[PDB]
């Protein structure tokens, strides 16, 4: 059978590999570096485009750009570079031999779904392809046809009620606030403590810090009080040039913005609130199988202690005769990619692919007839 | 003798099973469903139509419709999906090896009797069949050959005087009000209290509520006053997604429409008025037994306290020297099916069947020669 | 005689003024703004509550709330703010000198009719008051005493057959889908085109767009085809920060949900269908005046080209020996308020008002003995 490349379009990490395997085989940063100055390398070759880990090692001399900003492809040129690198550098295979599965947000722009369909088929010459909602794949990785997924990426958070494998198009909710924003916010609040960070390279350390040291508090006022009353809510981090910095209440404050969007000046409601409001758009006999399967997904959900917080919050908004229970997969950061690996290796799914012939007949439009 | 399948054509519950048994083998909802959208399920085999407990549980994907509305078959294609489900899913038997007995309302349209007869001999290939009035079977199940039946079924209410055999064909009286419109009415009057409902998934819980909590008042003004003077005429119900609702005077108001059809814009006489107007058409030497034996039948008569109300009402209409009694069977919801189950087991009844040979010789017209 | 304030409880526009005038004298948005942040204004006074146009100018710094969501008062506090502003800011008069006429949906909750009666009388100290179903006033504004009104507001849609003084309570049909929903839907389908709107302020531009650019197609498939075959079904709109956006097929798709509720997951039937199913519950001797007088009312009906669509749809459901004809008033958006102004000006109507004494005797409950 044809080996399908599953490529998760994560906004701060690419996750890529082959279908039928239990885990991604390449996990690298979504970063394209291009030179700030030319002349840097003399006696050695210069290139102008570095991608992923190659770019990461050269960060000092590169201008980093993100291909995907807030789950939205913002530059077609940087999306292409990521792709060129995925196939030829990272997996070292011809894409033209391998069908492609691409991941997307709910309500991912149609003009974008098309430019993605077109770019894959004309330049890479893919034999077949498909595009699928991130949360639907994470639900298949959770072994379920039906449930509501809180998917919080490295850039967007969605609440996605799904039923018999279809995401409910009137009931889904979105929040632009997650891992990308979270770094920029963390950096702000550290400047406020007097650990000013103004350089973007230092920003990436702040990113790493965030992933390692942030934790979801179970009670925001009680932990805040604890940090005000004692310095036991602080963890040290040694910067790689030396210099020991102390990260305080910023640890739980940073992700606190997910529950209270007003802290960054939004009119948006919180991730627990949009969970509750999303299920309340659904019919009562499916509210049962939706509430019974509240699933966490994506990189932002890997902060410890999140389940007890989300269990709390949802039981407080929701009536005490729906079964409330948080499902947190063992490696929830990958559950989109794992769900794509499952879906692309089902014998029933092989009828669904966009073929090169259907693209030649209808142009990039074909995704809006084959994908749902 | 050959085992007869007895099918109760109920407008809200189908009742089904083998003849010669004291109670029905299958009691399931009168519902049929079809997909709301193109594409309906992933990871398991799709179906073009759904019935019974599968339609009641897998509800969210389905446009539900009802095969029998208002005591009348309203869509042939859904009545066939009930019958196909009944033989092959529920009783798991071949109907082509068994006679079939169908229940009906009085004054059933000739075109409907013919289309049912034709479906039985040509869709289901049956060796034999018969069709019988609900009230006649309920009276026979009660151990009697003479009396008047107030058959307040699922979808219609009928008044049916019977003597030493068959119903009196000139004396029968009808009202277009029973358990079907009772749900829709209940739902209206709850919106009025400020417990608005809009979803047909809510309407089926309102249905369940009605069956559990409605009660026939003995005195309508005195109970109404009691509820206006005190909140002791209210019972709580916890909905299946939490949220405790309080059902008030709606409990007795809902069924009050049976006595006063002007509450819902109808011109018709009430269940007691149509009882009296039916008995007054009967012959004087049998008026004695008809007034003495007033029999309750059907799902709508299972509200508590109905007998004392009906005893009252009929004694007020009819003179005080035919000695009125209400006969309420122990399981009066089922007496139609139980009467068919008893009757179809008798050696004297085996001469009444419409055979496949008589259908070959006379076509659909045969039912109007063989039925009474 | 006493000058009556007629106040239409519209869900996205308040319309208010004095009885006996031919048009509203204040037309402003139903919006209460309260501060997202305090500290915004330094050296100038801050207030915490802005209402109507005052709120509109300050939208950037305000959290907007609707007093009335889907024709249902959802917050008593925001309803009060609208009122306080109506009397003292907008009309600059003492309400305690002026009797009041309020407007409501059919089946408007009784607990709500009472909290409205109570709030008007205790706080505002009104001398007398009345409450009327929106559609019943729009019939009088159409110059008529019998007919069927379709009323589609900025939040709910109503079907209301009326005869010489009564609306028929069994024949009325309601749908929650109209102008409020229509904005939220429009916004979703624009994100889908790739004009993502995620901010609520931008939502209000989307509201304005909807009112200006939406049009009812006469044939949904033929216009849809036209937009697929040519870009001549698109109108430009320049956002007030600059940036020219192009609004496509969304123009006719947005209101298309009124004819096909399944587009947004609802189990309900279309506005045409519920017009037909409403008239078919009425008496045959009055149907002759109902079908001949389909009166259109409310803000959602002001999309061009509605009548030819409605004429079509209704003749297709209805027999061709009822005279079918759409009556669309010259300024149908105001017909509720105009009908209230007409009704409250009649010397025969001065006997109908709820008095302060009857409120002191019976509490808020008095409305159900005076309003019909």
Tell me A242's DSSP state.
B
For residues A51 and A111, give the distance between their C-alpha atoms in angstroms, rounded to a whole number. Answer: 25
Buried b (16+ CB within 10 A) or exposed e, B127-136: bbbbbbbbbb
What letter would DSSP give residue B3? P
Say if residues B58 and B50 touch (Cβ distance below 8 Å).
yes
Q: Does A262 touch chain C (CB under 8 A)?
A: yes
Local structure of C175: helix, strand or coil: strand
**In Å, what is the CA distance from A277 to each residue of A172, A366, B129?**
9, 33, 54
Query: What value, to the nearest 5°, has the Cα angle with vertex A359 and ends A357 and A361?
Result: 70
CA atoms in the 13 A half-sphere facing the CB of B52: 19
Measured at the CA of A182, the angle between CA A178 and CA A188, to 5 degrees, comes to 155
For residues B358 and C111, what is the distance between their CA atoms, to the nearest angstrom? 64
Widest CA span in chain C: 72
CB-facing half-sphere around the CA of B117: CA atoms within 13 A = 27
Chains that touch B (3 or more CB pairs under 8 A): A, C
Closest to A115 in 3D by CA, of A93, A70, A149, A83: A83
**Distance from the A19 Cα atom to the nearest Cα atom in chain B, whole angstroms:** 17
User: In angstroms, rounded to a whole number, what is the distance separating the alpha carbons of residues C218 and A15?
Assistant: 49
Beta bridge partners of C17: C6
Give yes or no for a contact between B33 and B51, defined as CB atoms under 8 angstroms apart.
yes
Q: How far apart are CA B368 and CA B281, in angstroms?
A: 24
Q: Are the C-beta atoms of residues C215 and C234 closer than 8 Å to each other? A: no
Helix (H, G, I), strand (E, B) or coil at B236: strand
Q: Within 13 Å, how many C-alpha atoms sit on residue A279's CB side?
A: 30
How far apart, in whole angstroms, are the C-alpha atoms of residue A314 and residue A323?
Answer: 11
φ, ψ dihedrals at A164, nearest 5°? 50, 30
CA–CA separation, A127 and A355 (whole Å): 7
Q: How far apart are CA B207 and CA B205, in angstroms?
A: 5
How far A198 CA lies from chain C's nearest CA (Å)? 27
**What values do phi and psi take at B152, rounded to 5?**
-90, 85
Length of chain C equals 372
State the alpha helices, DSSP H only, in chain B: 52-57, 76-85, 110-122, 134-141, 179-193, 200-213, 220-229, 250-256, 271-279, 284-292, 306-317, 335-343, 356-362, 367-370
Distance between C129 CA and the closest CA of chain A, angstroms: 37
DSSP conformation class of B89: I
- Cβ(B299)–Cβ(B12) below 8 Å: yes
Q: How do beta strands B5-8 and A294-297 pair?
A: unpaired
Burial of B193 (0-12, 13-18, 19+ CB in 10 A): middle
Q: Which residue has the tokens 């969970």?
A: A275
Which residue among B37, B40, B201 places its CB closest to the CB of A283? Answer: B201
Contact A41, A137 (CB under 8 A): no
Report the 10 Å Cβ neighbour count for A70: 19
Q: Which of A171, A190, A136, A151 is CA-nearest to residue A349?
A: A136
The answer to whether the CB atoms of C176 and B198 lie below 8 A apart is yes
- Burial (CB count within 10 angstroms: exposed 0-12, middle 13-18, buried 19+), residue A237: middle
Answer positive or negative: Cα dihedral of C121, C126, C127, C129. negative
- Selected residue of A143, A162, A281, A284 to mutate for chain B interface (largest B Cβ count, 10 A): A284
Question: Under a CB-based contact definition with an 8 Å cutoff, are residues C75 and C67 in contact?
Answer: yes
Q: Which of C40, C32, C144, C128 is nearest to C371 (CA)?
A: C128
Structure tokens that stand for B320 in this block: 């005080």
Are A153 and A178 in contact by the 8 Å Cβ rule? The answer is yes
Q: Residue C109 and residue B264: Cβ atoms within 8 Å?
A: no
| Chain-chain contact of C36 with A265 (C-beta, under 8 angstroms) | yes
Question: At residue A131, what are phi and psi to the nearest 5 degrees?
Answer: -130, 130
Strands C146-152 and B62-65, by their bridges, are unpaired
Largest Cα span, chain A: 72
Chain C nearest C-alpha distance from B45 (Å):
23
Residue C321: Cβ-neighbour burial (10 angstroms; 0-12, 13-18, 19+): exposed
| Tokens 């802005």 -> residue | C50
* C72-73 and C68-69 beta bridge pairing: antiparallel
Query: Which residue in this structure is represented by tokens 């009025």?
Result: B192
Q: H-helix or E-strand containing A167? A: strand A166-167
Closest in B196, B199, B264 to C170, CB measured? B264
Exposure pattern of B294-326 as b/e (b: 16+ CB <10 Å)? bbbbbbbbbbeebbebbeebbeeebeeeeebeb
Between CA B193 and CA B185 the distance in angstroms is: 13
- Closest by CA position to A72, among listed A111, A117, A108: A108
C264 contacts on A by Cβ (under 8 Å): 170
For chain B, the residue count is 372
Question: H helices of chain A, where?
Answer: 52-57, 76-85, 110-122, 134-141, 179-193, 200-213, 220-229, 250-256, 271-280, 284-291, 306-317, 335-343, 356-362, 367-370
HSE at residue C360, side-chain half, CA atoms within 13 A, is: 7
A168 contacts C194? CB cut-off 8 A: no
The answer to whether A300 and A154 have CB atoms below 8 angstroms apart is yes
Name the strands in the sheet holding B147-152, side by side, starting at the edge strand that comes first in the sequence. Answer: B173-175, B157-162, B147-152, B294-297, B326-327
Question: What's the CA gap between B168 and B282, in Å, rounded?
Answer: 8
Unique residue bearing structure tokens 């509200």:
B303
Quote the tokens at residue C226: 């036209």
- Give the mutation candidate from B181, B265, B266, B268 for the C interface (greatest C CB count, under 10 A): B265
**CA B316 to the chain's CA centroid:** 27
Given a contact cutoff of 8 angstroms between Cβ atoms, the answer to whether A187 and A181 are in contact is: no
> How far apart are the CA of B186 and the nearest CA of chain C, in angstroms?
12
For every residue of C24-65, DSSP letters joined together read: -SEEEE--EEEESSSSS-SSS---S-EEHHHHHHTGGGEEEE
Contact yes or no for B201 and C109 at CB 8 A: no
Q: How does DSSP assign A168-194, residue by residue?
A: -TTT-EEE--SHHHHHHHHHHHHHHHT
Q: What is the DSSP string of C236-268?
A: EEE-BTB-EEEE-THHHHHHHTTT-GGGGT--P
Q: How far is B243 from chain A (nearest CA, A)?
A: 6
DSSP lists the bridge partners of residue C29 as: C13
Three-state DSSP class for B273?
Answer: helix
Which residue shows structure tokens 């109300």?
Answer: B309
B103 token code pair: 């229940």
C-alpha distances (whole Å) from A128 to each of A3, A359, B326, C22, C107 are 11, 9, 75, 66, 55
Chains with 3 or more CB pairs under 8 A to chain A: B, C
With CB atoms and an 8 Å threshold, state whether C196 touches A107: yes
Residue B46, classified by CB atoms within 10 Å of its CB into exposed (0-12), middle (13-18) or buried (19+), is: exposed
- Helices then strands (H, E): number in chain C? 13, 19
Q: If you count residue pairs, one on A and one on B, with CB atoms under 8 Å apart, how many are there?
A: 55
CA distance C218 to C224: 11
How close is the nearest chain B Cα to the Cα of C330, in Å? 33
Phi and psi at residue A182, to the nearest 5°:
-60, -40
- H helices of chain C, where? 52-57, 76-85, 110-122, 134-141, 179-193, 200-213, 220-229, 250-256, 271-279, 284-290, 306-317, 335-345, 356-362
Strand, coil or helix: what is A37? coil
Alpha helices (H) in B22-129, listed in sequence order:
52-57, 76-85, 110-122
Of A109, A169, A267, the CB nearest to C196: A109
CA-wise closest residue to B276 among B314, B322, B330, B238: B314
Q: Which residues on B lie below 8 Å from C267 (Cβ)? A: 199-201
Pairwise CA distance, residues C31 & C25, whole Å: 18
Query: Which tokens belong to C267?
Result: 């189990």
Q: Which two tokens stand for residue B353?
A: 């069947």
Question: CA-CA distance, B86 to B52, in Å (whole number)?
Answer: 9
Q: What is the DSSP letter of B160?
A: E
Reading the block at residue A309, the tokens are 């917080």
- Do C46 and C40 form a contact (C-beta atoms < 8 A)? yes
Q: Does A283 touch chain B (CB under 8 A)?
A: yes
Chain B to chain C Cβ contacts (< 8 Å): 29
Instruction: Determine whether the interchain pair C194/A170 forms a contact, defined as Cβ–Cβ distance below 8 Å.
Output: no
Find, among C104, C2, C72, the residue nearest to C372 by Cα. C104
Helix, strand, coil share (%) of chain C residues, nearest 5: 45, 20, 35
**Resolution of the solved structure (Å):** 8.0
Tokens 């009125």 locate to: B324
Residue of A107, A172, A263 best to disrupt the C interface, most CBs of C under 10 A: A107
A68, β-bridge pairs: A73
Q: Is B242 on the interface with A (CB under 8 A)?
A: yes
């Amino acid at each position: 059978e044809t080996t399908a490349l599953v490529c998760d379009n994560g906004s701060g990490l690419v996750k890529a590999g082959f279908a039928g395997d239990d885990a991604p085989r390449a996990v690298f940063p979504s970063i394209v570096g291009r030179p700030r100055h030319q002349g840097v390398m003399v006696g050695m070759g210069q290139k102008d485009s570095y991608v992923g880990d190659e770019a990461q090692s050269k960060r000092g001399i590169l201008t980093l750009k993100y291909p995907i900003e807030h789950g939205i492809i913002t530059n077609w040129d940087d999306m292409e570079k990521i792709w060129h690198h995925t196939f030829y550098n990272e997996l070292r295979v011809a894409p033209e031999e391998h069908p492609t599965l691409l991941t997307e947000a709910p309500l991912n722009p149609k003009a974008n779904r098309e430019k993605m369909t077109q770019i894959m088929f004309e330049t890479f010459n893919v034999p077949a392809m498909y595009v699928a909602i991130q949360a639907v794949l994470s639900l298949y990785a959770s072994g379920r046809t039906t449930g509501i997924v809180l998917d919080s990426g490295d850039g967007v958070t969605h609440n996605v009620p799904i039923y018999e494998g279809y995401a409910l198009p009137h009931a889904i909710m979105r929040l632009d606030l997650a891992g990308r924003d979270l770094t920029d916010y963390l950096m702000k609040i550290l400047t406020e403590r007097g650990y000013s960070f103004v350089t973007t390279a230092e920003r990436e350390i702040v990113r790493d810090i965030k992933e390692k040291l942030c934790y979801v508090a179970l009670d925001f006022e009680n932990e805040m009080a604890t940090a005000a009353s004692s310095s036991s809510l602080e963890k040290s981090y040694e910067l790689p040039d030396g210099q020991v910095i102390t990260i305080g209440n910023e640890r739980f404050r940073c992700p606190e913005t997910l529950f209270q969007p007003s802290f960054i000046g939004m009119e948006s409601a919180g991730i627990h609130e949009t969970t509750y409001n999303s299920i309340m758009k659904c019919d009562i006999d499916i509210r049962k199988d939706l509430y019974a399967n509240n699933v966490l997904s994506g990189g932002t959900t890997m902060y410890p202690g999140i389940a007890d917080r989300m269990q709390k919050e949802i039981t407080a908004l929701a009536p005490s005769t729906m079964k409330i229970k948080i499902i947190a997969p063992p490696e929830r950061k990958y559950s989109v990619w794992i769900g794509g690996s499952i879906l692309a290796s089902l014998s029933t799914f092989q009828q669904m692919w966009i073929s090169k012939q259907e693209y030649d007949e209808a142009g990039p439009s074909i995704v809006h007839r084959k994908c749902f």
